[PDB]
Design an enzyme around this catalytic site. Structure first.
Site, PDB file in Angstrom:
ATOM      1  N   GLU A   1     -14.824  34.040  20.850  1.00  0.00           N
ATOM      2  CA  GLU A   1     -13.439  33.865  20.395  1.00  0.00           C
ATOM      3  C   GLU A   1     -12.623  35.157  20.413  1.00  0.00           C
ATOM      4  O   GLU A   1     -12.174  35.660  19.377  1.00  0.00           O
ATOM      5  CB  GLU A   1     -13.408  33.169  19.026  1.00  0.00           C
ATOM      6  CG  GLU A   1     -13.979  31.762  19.116  1.00  0.00           C
ATOM      7  CD  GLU A   1     -14.133  31.055  17.791  1.00  0.00           C
ATOM      8  OE1 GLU A   1     -14.715  31.639  16.848  1.00  0.00           O
ATOM      9  OE2 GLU A   1     -13.698  29.885  17.717  1.00  0.00           O
TER      10      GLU A   1
ATOM     11  N   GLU B   1     -21.016  25.659  21.428  1.00  0.00           N
ATOM     12  CA  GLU B   1     -20.968  25.044  20.100  1.00  0.00           C
ATOM     13  C   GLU B   1     -20.576  23.590  20.231  1.00  0.00           C
ATOM     14  O   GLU B   1     -19.646  23.257  20.959  1.00  0.00           O
ATOM     15  CB  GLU B   1     -19.953  25.753  19.199  1.00  0.00           C
ATOM     16  CG  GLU B   1     -20.312  27.193  18.893  1.00  0.00           C
ATOM     17  CD  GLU B   1     -19.130  27.973  18.410  1.00  0.00           C
ATOM     18  OE1 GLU B   1     -18.750  28.991  19.042  1.00  0.00           O
ATOM     19  OE2 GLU B   1     -18.566  27.547  17.390  1.00  0.00           O
TER      20      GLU B   1
END
Ligand SMILES: *[C@@H]1C[C@@H](O)[C@@H](O)[C@@H](CO)O1
Ligand SMILES: [Mg+2]
Ligand code: NA
Ligand code: NA
Lengths: 210, 211
Positions: free
Chosen positions: B69, B145
């Site tokens: 991220e 994820e």
């Protein structure tokens, strides 16, 4: 007097095993064609485009049979309705293609077309191409013609594109079938089929299987 | 990068490891403000290069990750290539900037659904089945994820596994995540209780989102 002996079964039948009625006979048109001794024997029309389809080149390869002569010419003219949009004239004799020369009995005309009206199922824009076989000094020997649709079909990056845009095929397979006349097709039935297909949001047909 | 013993144990017990550089800049606006800035390339490079230098002999490490991220910036492309150059033995993955950028060998989205598209501007999450066959796409897809296990969760976990088994290039994923980040506090009687965000006077906080 013509005499035609038609065989129902032949070695050709081994390649005609389509899932359909097995019939036989002279089931499409019979016609007589008169061509001059010096004649257009073949012609191919291609249309190529720049990146945004604002420019096109119509390329028409024309082949003749008969005695080759220096005075012979082909004119290919392109028409949008009553307006001639483009024209080109050339004598026979193609470019050199190998050690033995080129096709003396062929010529390729290239016509520039600015902002061509593109063909699609959505808007079927058509031009008329007239192919004239003639003497240099203006005697027409014969003319042939076809409808021309400016469109590019290509597969790029896994997508089938028409005029640069990905198609979504709303298609149907269609046999040549009539409940009364069998496998004989007529204009009325064809037109009926086409109107019904388009009215029901089909844009494509597969000629199953011939 | 984990405590060094973790890799030894994964080597010996047998688990495939994604070793990930300590780079997350989630809070930047936009997410890649630092990772696209060449002035931050030195600090970023050291987080990648010293990880590789430490862990490159562990058989359990099968894939390198550029971090998490941090958008996609030019600094990712440089470091992607640095690893590919020094260690051709392992694929390099990175999810930032849309999960399928030039800085990843693996399409590695977070929470892309099985059948349902989420067409966010710039960074869409395609249906994983659809993502694979996007024009020109050839890479494997492994979700970095998925199946967010927050509280009463894992609804639809079987849908993922049906798809993984049916599609060769859908090669699984990493559930988020293993263990609740709750902390132990004690009441006036010395009785332990599980605590989350905000329970330490910490503010602002994001409450139970750590579990
Ligand atoms: C595909 C080929 C076509 O000719 C039909 O046989 C059809 C089944 O009715 O399948
Ligand atoms: Mg069949
Ligand atoms: Na699979
Ligand atoms: Na969380």
């Amino acid at each position: 007097r013509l005499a035609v002996m038609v065989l129902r079964w032949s070695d050709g039948s081994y390649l005609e095993d389509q899932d359909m009625w097995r019939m036989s006979g002279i089931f499409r048109d019979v016609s007589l064609l008169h061509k001059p001794t010096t004649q257009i024997s073949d012609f191919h029309v291609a249309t190529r485009f720049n990146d945004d389809f604002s420019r096109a080149v119509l390329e028409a390869e024309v082949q003749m049979c008969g005695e080759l002569r220096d005075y012979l010419r082909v004119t290919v003219s392109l028409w949008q309705g009553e307006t001639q949009v483009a024209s080109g004239t050339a004598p026979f004799g193609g470019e050199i293609i190998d050690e033995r020369g080129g096709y003396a009995d062929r010529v390729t005309l290239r016509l520039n077309v600015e902002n061509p009206k593109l063909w699609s199922a959505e808007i079927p824009n058509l031009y008329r191409a007239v192919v004239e076989l003639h003497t240099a000094d203006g005697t027409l020997i014969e003319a042939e013609a076809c409808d021309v649709g400016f469109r590019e079909v290509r597969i790029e990056n896994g997508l089938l594109l028409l005029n640069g845009k990905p198609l979504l095929i709303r298609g149907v397979n269609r046999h040549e079938h009539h409940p009364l006349h069998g496998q004989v097709m007529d204009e009325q039935t064809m037109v009926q089929d086409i109107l019904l297909m388009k009215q029901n949001n089909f844009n494509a047909v597969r000629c199953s299987h011939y | 990068p984990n405590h060094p013993l973790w890799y030894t144990l994964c080597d010996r017990y047998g688990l495939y490891v994604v070793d990930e550089a300590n780079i997350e800049t989630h809070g930047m606006v936009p997410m890649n403000r630092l990772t696209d800035d060449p002035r931050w390339l030195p600090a970023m490079s050291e987080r990648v290069t010293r990880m590789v230098q430490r862990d490159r002999n562990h058989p359990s490490v099968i894939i390198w990750s550029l971090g998490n991220e941090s958008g996609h910036g030019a600094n990712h492309d440089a470091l992607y290539r640095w690893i590919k150059s020094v260690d051709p033995s392992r694929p390099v993955q990175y999810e930032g900037g849309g999960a399928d950028t030039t800085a990843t060998d693996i399409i590695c989205p977070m929470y892309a659904r099985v059948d349902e598209d989420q067409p966010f501007p710039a960074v869409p999450k395609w249906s994983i089945k659809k993502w694979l066959s996007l024009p020109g796409e050839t890479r494997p897809l492994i979700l970095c994820e998925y199946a967010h296990a927050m509280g009463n969760s894992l609804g639809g976990f079987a849908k993922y596994w049906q798809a993984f088994r049916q599609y060769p290039r859908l090669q699984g994923g990493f559930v988020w995540d293993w263990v609740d980040q709750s902390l132990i506090k004690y009441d006036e009687n010395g009785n332990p209780w599980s605590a989350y965000g905000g329970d330490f006077g910490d503010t602002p906080n994001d409450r139970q989102f750590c579990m």
